[PDB]
């Protein structure tokens, strides 16, 4: 029981922490572009996607090999708890 509680607490923790850096690197560049639009008046609502695509695709570029060694380290542990 205490491992079923631990494995459920860690699956939600890894979802929270792996979707952390791409969702805070697409937030500062969602807010500072609009703060530039508060100084100079622009009425183009479809503007900060041009930076949001480069922000998410460059954050997923440097940490690409890092996600594989957190998914493999958690996926090998849960099967050892399953079988043994």
């Amino acid at each position: 029981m205490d491992d079923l509680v631990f494995a459920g607490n860690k699956a939600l923790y890894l979802v929270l922490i792996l979707s952390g850096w791409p969702t805070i690197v697409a937030t500062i560049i969602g807010l500072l572009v609009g703060l530039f639009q508060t100084v100079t008046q622009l009425q183009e609502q479809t503007l900060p996607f041009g930076i949001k695509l480069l922000g998410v695709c460059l954050c997923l570029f440097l940490l690409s090999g890092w996600y594989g060694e957190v998914l493999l380290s958690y996926g090998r542990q849960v099967i050892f708890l399953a079988l043994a």
């Binding site: 609502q45 479809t46 996607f49 041009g50 695509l53």
Partner: protein
Amino acid sequence: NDISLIALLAFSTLLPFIIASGTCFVKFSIVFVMVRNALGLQQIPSNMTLNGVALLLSMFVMWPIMHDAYVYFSSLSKHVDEGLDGYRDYLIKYSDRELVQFFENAKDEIEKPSIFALLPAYALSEIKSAFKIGFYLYLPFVVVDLVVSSVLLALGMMMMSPVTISTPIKLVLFVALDGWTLLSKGLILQYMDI
């Protein structure tokens, strides 16, 4: 021949157990549906013709194996092992040697392993290799699925499903590449050389 019609109908329900597990039909039929799902099709072409092309390609490497058993084959104890020795020197090629020792315990030149010990490892080795070469096919289509979905998002049309646009492009990327014949050439050259 009423003692033999049971020996014919049981053979006709025994070949669907063997062809679906212990031949190259396993690796053949999986990639045809993974490339069917990579384009974004559900009912095209069917589930029936994809087992037909894979069965016709499956006997291209099994008919040279089956002819050796037809010429060769309580005296039927040692009669069967040499009739299947042409099938058991093929099953050691495409299986894992450490895995067949796991089933043999739970050299190989001086003694070939047991025939019931390496057929599950052959099945697991072809499901694993079909999943590996099936992951490769998905990637080009995923790139042309993310490009059109981010070009329409460069415009203001966030309420627009890109499946109505990506489906023309995905099957010109498969016919300008000549995809269907290209996969079958590599599937034949992975078993029988030219």
